[PDB]
Amino acid sequence: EVQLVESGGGLVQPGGSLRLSCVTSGFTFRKFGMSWVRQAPGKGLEWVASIATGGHTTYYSDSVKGRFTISRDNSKNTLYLQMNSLRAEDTAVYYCTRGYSSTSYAMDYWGQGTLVTVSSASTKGPSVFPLAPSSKSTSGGTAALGCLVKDYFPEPVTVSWNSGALTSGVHTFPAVLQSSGLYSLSSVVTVPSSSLGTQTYICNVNHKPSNTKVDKKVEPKSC
Amino acid sequence: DIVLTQSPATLSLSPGERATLSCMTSTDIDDDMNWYQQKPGQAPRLLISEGNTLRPGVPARFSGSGSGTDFTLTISSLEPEDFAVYYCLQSFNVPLTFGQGTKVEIKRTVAAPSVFIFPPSDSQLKSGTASVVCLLNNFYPREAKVQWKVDNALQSGNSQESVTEQDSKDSTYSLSSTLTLSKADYEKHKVYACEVTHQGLSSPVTKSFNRGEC
């Protein structure tokens, strides 16, 4: 029925510009107010801007005022967001949204969102380091081992174990953004201590932006 | 700007129980409160609009009440699909403002973490950096404190934590804490320790290693 489809997002340098578009279907576009709302990674919702049916009357959050411009083309069912002088903290998923009534910007329909990443970092593949099982792993008990996937940009990376054959007990953590502007994450798995000398554990790491594909065998460290 | 204060930030309940979620505003907004549900990876969904109006298609177990400064979203009996994050939004004035969210999560019995510490690999050291990793595995509730110690000196400012979502099978969390040091700094110490405080542990558990040991 009602669809809102965003496009135009991507990676940009601080100081740079992007223009988002949202193309709508399933309602008479010119009769509705529209808004942009964003969500920074791991954070809540934040309203960015709104525009009235006629496309002249506009509203902005203080965070973006003077840098972002909302506009619409009623003959194309399209909403725009011109984003200038971008900053790292503008990084977020941007959603196109519809005001649910003729007198309110409260949102009923939302697009799937478009990701905007503002960073001066360059594309870089991770180094993958073993998190080796402890030599003190309990006899007949449970051991932990893993892989540290360090210093990559941009998101995302994927990690599997034993080419997808090992899934039980695996925890792959959300990446963290380091002060360097690069990401790191860890993936771990718990396994029987009794398996450490005979079973093979391999983390399969893929970072598509850099064409980095690494398999790291994680084993007890020899002494 | 109008501030919306949602509480509690986390609501821990079981399927079948009544959920009560509060949103308080810094000024009277009449009845222009709206409530959203959001699931991981998904766009929010409008549940209740201005005037505590239940949206068409939304199950009857959701209801909004209150006006002025104190608003409530009630889920009469939680279904499994209702464990999610909920946001309130005032549409009384611009700028439009949201509460910071309430996560409705699955309550379960107390589970202590198992704890593991990992030294930096030789290959990482070769490159000029040392990351030390502490894992807290399969614990509940979420509250957990990790304190890094280096030759018994408490560390601050040089670690970062990350946490998984509640496990689909056992409703526990896992957490990793990473202590990041220069290679030079790593190599002027002997004992690296992770101390874990969690209410499921009768007293804190420490895992440690000595640099250069098997």
């Binding site: 107010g33 009235a52 049916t53 009357t57 009534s101 007198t103 309110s104 | 009384f92 004035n93 611009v94």
Partner: peptide
């Protein structure tokens, strides 16, 4: 209160 326009007039 209601310091905004949604439907142009």
């Amino acid at each position: 209160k209601g310091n905004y326009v949604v439907t142009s007039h």
